[PDB]
Design a protein around this ligand. Structure first.
Ligand SMILES: O=P([O-])([O-])O
Lengths: 471, 478, 352, 251
């Protein structure tokens, strides 16, 4: 027979014993359906995933929901296949959970719909593409110091309470409304209020007609938090694999996946790692990251947000994900506290597209000059903090004078922040910002006060702000 | 018999192991022969792990354990209002038993994505600084963070007291506090007459960690019953650091590998599962609401610590208090740089929106100009005028404890301050001037107060200015 | 039955095996008396305390003295109750150890005196006072700048050569003269010569007639060093419980208590904590600090000294101790040199 | 007599009132040492700590004292040279030497100080005065840690067992000044502690400082300059000091 019994319950981990010679394979799905016999029992409907083989016809599994009410000796049914999620044109405009069940209260999906397994191997070496081109976003810092790549990987690093949600919402508003393709959103391990607001905004804007969403949000157990991302990826891959259409993807927070993995690995019997993580941290992340690539059939562009615990950039989880990205942006609490938004570090951020033959000689020279001036200004902080500005030479004073103006001009005002301040916001082209930075570097605007460069947008508005102030 | 009876094998440090109980289920409640309750965590092949929710000195090897057939539950009812109970729901005040007919489980799923709604209603705390700079709406989660000796309990007491005239139910949870302080808090709440709509849940510092571990969950379970009937509830947690430490101690006693700062990996989920239960329900579910005000204690004013960052990454904002400012006699020592409200602003009434911007700008200008006050005041008179305005605003923002101020009076006084009517008044007389202005408004500004209360909008500026000048005529400059 | 014999000996940890169905309860006391039968044995007199139930009719205990000379199979008897300490008028002007046996060369207490257990639950919520009142000491600086609260905890900071002993004696004398109360002094792990000097300084001043003293030496096991505060507190509780009067309590050092608890936890073998301390530090501190309260017919207040190791105020032990304090007093060597007594700093001291 | 004996009671002691002369001007003027007091000497490796002990042993020629020297973890050639120079100066008429080289097994290194104090107590209880010097305690602590680890006992901070403080206090609490009824004898000890790179925040130094009544600091930089001894007066302290000096020196 293909039915087992429950042996041990240890929270999110359940043990099942099967008949000899009929053990299920790894990554299969098991179903438990029980009805109460008397007043001291509760109805149960739950699913499990196979993880390890312990020998003696024993299987170690992981639960996808709360395990309260389980009793030793219950019956288990084996399906013989991994988790399957419906995919196709039906998924457009709907909201799904970890198991592919709609939660939008718009009806059910017919049982004849095509569905695909979640687990699959990575694409081969010879099927990849390496074309590079620049994608424009409309933000001065990103467009100048770390251009994005169409069809690559982009990651955002930041701490707690630094302003990542505003930045990602601004990116969605600027890019998603004119992509002209297919968009997929994942909400792994984040707030429910943000998801509800995003859903209502999409409904109001009408973009929801060509997108799908899988949330699996913060309150869900680690079993679901480890599979939401895989469900979203297997939903996204079908379009570019069977139609060759351009796909744009978002991931809400990838750190919660590794956090849930570390939480689960403790009860499986593995020895702790250096900082208490699982021993298999690298391979588990690599298997997922290597699956998001652009091939000859189609291209996929993705934007990911990564959480930095306790503002420590040397933590293993943030440190091991740097080798998978192409362009990175870093947020700093020190810059955030000074009133500079979106508080992007100009020296830590890097990109692969910053080349003379890709962007342009003038842009390359301007960026290099700005970085050099910023570094030279940074080198004088120790002397400035103690001995003041009096002991500096003539060149250092001018360097500081222009560095302050550049640092203040690097800020910008967004459309989303209008509801809190009343300022409409602006959209700045690459040529405009390059010309403005070149003019600033040339020393044309050395007579204006530094307070006129804050949240101004284009260069021409600086003059009108100064004359409104009274200069 | 092994079906529903078991025997104890090992006892130590509040953790016991039993043999038997074949039909027991995970999360069920068990009862010892001594009368102490317990909870079953692990269902192993040959034994069951039990956590003792009480004194473990009376339990010895060879005792008898029997089932109860119920998942972990607490009694909830309307009769619970005005009583002091333990996390298990037993009365502690000694005024007799409490009768209830309904119970709710401790662990319950949170409302879904489609069941929520945007926050659009205000919550008046009675504190001028908070109500002006950091508005709080119904259904919002707001964090209060600060060092010790900052008077965090006074803010909670005042905001609980201020809800007398509004349809709100308050629940106060004390974790790891002192029994004398809890007794004094209950006494002053009774003296101020706030016991008619409040419930107090206590857990002393001498109680075991498992009892210290379930108080917030019991409070949320008690509040959900009123939340789901279409009412509004307010819940305050005294300290989450004590609960975190108790959970860390229990996990270490269970021999699990620790992580950063000897904390387990479940510490983030522990707080998320609790704080995710506060939401504003939609119109299709009755329109109820629930709000929480957790407290966090820091060491040496360090805001980049593990637990503070974990709590910040969940809530919708934070309020920071400074001990250096608190030492100068200022009770609401609110730092305006690190305190930000996100959900708020859309819940404020129209009167406060018209006036808050200029006050914020003046306060920011004064704070940024304070750095050069050592040798300042010799600059241009335009710069010199900033110092007087900033000092006057700082004097206005002060408040006395246990004395909430009505929102209309706050609007009127802030309008008077921002319109420059106080530029000719000495700094030392601002408090007496505002007290006499409140008395004069009560005596004669009845029509203006009624118009404000009825329309949520400012009255006509001509009449407002003429009334202000009429009052100012009789004031003594002293 | 109540009879068992040793199965394992290793350091200050001893395991005893009993019969099934007759295991002693936790925190019980055991006695071992044995006389040498041959020339290859040594007389033994030792006391044990039950700590855990390991199962299979085995009990793990901790020793209160040296364990040299123990032999496997030696019989053990059970008293059936925790450590008992005599209370009453007979304890005034006497010196006792952790077990309650007198140290002074003035005889022993008769065996018919009343004795009380060491471990006791905290008073209930109903018995606490509902009002706050100020204790009057008669010292101008304290009464004006840092008032004392009945039932509160006061932390004292200072060093050698400033007048801590003089201030303590003055407080005891004033309280005894005015309020009619008494005082109890407990020293946890301090220097024997300093203790003897303090004893002589109390003896030649006439104050010793209204106080009781409990001493715990440095050369004692951590289990013995961990219960001195408890025995002093249970000595003090009797007067307020029965006579109904205000009582003073002094603790020489509180850091030694936490360090002894950490050593005991390490000996038992539990997993460490954040900075290597015991996992149960907070609850161990609370179970001791929660019994010093003010009831409807009496009150107990305590003066405690803190060490603050490594000059770090964020250390977990000082952080946990500071959460129970209600007032702070400081002593200034500059004022002592200038000649102002008691040289209490008027600006550093704060009170709630 | 057995090596493990109880310490004298609290009521059998008398306050220290008799000075001990070492013959070193800095020690005799700034940090006085009295009979019955036991004091810690701490420093780095190249500070010449052995010279102070040799000089203070030599200076007791005509003061009616008995000296015991204990060597723990030292080199046999160095011990031989110390014995030879002591014989040359004639100090072997009233001294006893106990040695335990680094090649010996750990239990001997662990047990030597108890044998030394057991030998000293016999002369102490007859009404005489005894001086005992311990060469190193960190090596004894390391040997005890090695034995406990080899015996499979649970470790603590820095892999040390849970009773290292008890082990040190039990040994250091046996020095006292007896009363008139007991005979009036006395015993004093001068334990040594060696630090690495000049830190004093380590576990064993903190434990020893929390027990002793004072410490004497030796400066590596001052020794490198050429000052003998390189005593640092800014950190040295003597709690018993003042009451253990003659009137002339006190004035
Ligand atoms: O504040 P956040 O959103 O977490 O960045």
């Amino acid at each position: 027979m293909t039915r087992g019994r429950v042996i041990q319950v240890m929270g999110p981990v359940v043990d099942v014993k099967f008949e000899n010679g009929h053990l299920p394979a790894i990554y299969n799905a098991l179903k438990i359906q029980h009805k109460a016999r008397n007043e001291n029992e509760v109805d149960i409907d739950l699913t499990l995933e196979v993880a390890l083989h312990l020998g003696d016809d024993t299987v170690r599994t992981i639960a996808m929901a709360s395990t309260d009410g389980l009793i030793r000796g219950m019956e288990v049914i084996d399906t013989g296949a991994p988790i399957s999620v419906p995919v196709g044109e039906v998924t457009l405009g709907r909201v799904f959970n970890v198991l592919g069940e709609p939660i939008d209260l718009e009806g059910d999906i017919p049982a004849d719909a095509r569905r695909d397994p979640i687990h699959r191997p990575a694409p081969k070496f010879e099927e990849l593409a390496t074309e590079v081109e620049i994608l424009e976003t409309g933000i001065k810092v990103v467009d100048l110091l770390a251009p994005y790549i169409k069809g690559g990987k982009i990651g955002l690093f930041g701490g707690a309470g630094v302003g990542k949600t505003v930045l990602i919402q601004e990116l969605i508003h600027n890019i998603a409304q004119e992509h002209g393709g297919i968009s997929v959103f994942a909400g792994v391990g984040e707030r429910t209020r943000e998801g509800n607001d995003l859903y209502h905004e999409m409904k109001d804007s009408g973009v929801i007609s060509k997108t799908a969403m899988v949330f699996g949000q913060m309150n869900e157990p680690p079993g679901a938090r480890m599979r939401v991302a895989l469900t979203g990826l297997t939903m996204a891959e079908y379009f570019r694999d069977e139609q060759g259409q351009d796909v744009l993807l978002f991931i809400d927070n990838i750190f919660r996946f590794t956090q849930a993995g570390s939480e689960v690995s403790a009860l499986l019997g593995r020895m702790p790692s250096a900082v208490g993580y699982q021993p298999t941290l690298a391979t588990e992340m690599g298997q997922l990251q290597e699956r998001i690539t652009s091939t000859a059939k189609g291209s996929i562009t993705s934007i990911q947000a990564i959480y930095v615990p306790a503002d420590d950039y040397t933590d293993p989880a943030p440190a091991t994900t740097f080798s998978h990205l192409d362009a990175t942006t870093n947020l700093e609490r020190k810059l955030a506290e000074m009133g500079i938004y979106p508080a992007v570090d100009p020296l830590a951020s890097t990109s692969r597209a910053l080349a003379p033959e890709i962007v342009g000689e003038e842009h390359y020279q301007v960026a290099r000059k700005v970085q050099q001036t910023l570094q030279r200004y940074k080198e004088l902080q120790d002397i400035i903090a103690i001995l003041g500005m009096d002991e500096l030479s003539d060149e250092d004073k001018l360097v500081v004078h222009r560095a302050r103006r550049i640092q203040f001009f690097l800020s910008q005002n967004f459309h989303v922040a209008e509801q809190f301040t009343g300022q409409p916001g602006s959209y700045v082209p690459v040529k405009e910002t390059v010309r403005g930075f070149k003019e600033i570097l040339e020393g044309k605007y050395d007579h204006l006060p530094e307070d006129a460069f804050r949240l101004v947008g284009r260069i021409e508005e600086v003059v009108e702000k100064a004359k409104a102030m009274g200069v | 018999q092994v079906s529903d009876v078991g025997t104890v094998i090992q006892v130590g440090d509040g953790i016991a192991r039993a043999h038997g109980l074949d039909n027991v289920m995970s999360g069920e409640l068990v009862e010892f022969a001594n009368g102490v309750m317990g909870m079953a965590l692990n269902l192993e092949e040959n034994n069951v792990g039990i956590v003792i929710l009480g004194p473990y000195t009376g339990i010895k090897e060879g005792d008898e354990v029997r089932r109860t057939g119920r998942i972990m539950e607490v009694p909830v009812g309307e009769a619970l209002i005005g009583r002091v109970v333990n996390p298990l729901g037993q009365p502690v005040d000694g005024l007799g038993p409490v009768e209830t007919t309904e119970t709710r489980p401790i662990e319950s799923p949170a409302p879904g994505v489609m069941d929520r709604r945007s926050v659009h209603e205000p919550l008046q705390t009675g504190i001028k600084a908070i109500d002006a700079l950091v508005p709080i709406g119904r259904g919002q989660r707001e964090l209060i963070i600060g060092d010790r000796q900052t008077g965090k309990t006074s803010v909670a007491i005042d905001t609980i007291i201020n809800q007398k005239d509004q349809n709100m139910i308050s629940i106060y949870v004390a974790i790891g506090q002192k029994e004398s302080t809890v007794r004094t808090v209950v006494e002053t709440l009774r003296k101020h007459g706030a016991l008619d709509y409040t419930i107090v849940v206590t857990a002393s510092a001498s109680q075991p960690a498992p009892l210290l571990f379930l108080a917030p969950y019991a409070g949320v379970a008690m509040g959900e019953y009123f939340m789901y009937k279409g009412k509004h509830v307010l819940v305050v947690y005294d300290d989450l650091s004590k609960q975190a430490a108790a959970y860390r101690e229990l996990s270490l006693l269970l021999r699990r590998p620790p992580g950063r700062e000897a904390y387990p990996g479940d510490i983030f989920y522990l707080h998320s599962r609790l704080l995710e239960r506060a939401a504003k329900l939609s119109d299709a579910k009755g329109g109820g609401s629930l709000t929480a005000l957790p407290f966090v204690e820091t060491q040496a004013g360090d805001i980049s610590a593990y637990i503070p960052t974990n709590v910040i990454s969940i809530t919708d904002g934070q309020i920071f208090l400074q001990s250096d400012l608190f030492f100068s006699g200022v009770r609401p020592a609110i730092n305006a740089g690190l305190s930000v409200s996100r959900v708020g602003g859309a819940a404020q009434i129209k009167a406060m929106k018209k006036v808050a911007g200029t006050l914020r700008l003046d306060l920011a200008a004064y704070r940024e100009l304070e750095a050069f006050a050592q040798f300042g005041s010799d600059l241009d008179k335009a710069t010199q005028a900033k110092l007087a305005r900033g000092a006057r605003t700082v004097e206005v923002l002060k408040q006395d404890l246990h004395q909430p101020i009505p929102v209309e009076k706050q609007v009127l006084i802030i309008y008077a301050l921002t319109r420059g009517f106080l530029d000719d008044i000495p700094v030392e007389d601002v408090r007496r001037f505002e007290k006499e202005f409140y008395l004069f408004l009560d005596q004669n500004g009845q029509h203006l107060l009624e118009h404000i209360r009825t329309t949520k909008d400012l009255p006509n500026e001509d009449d407002l200015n003429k009334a202000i000048e009429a009052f100012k005529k009789t004031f003594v400059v002293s």
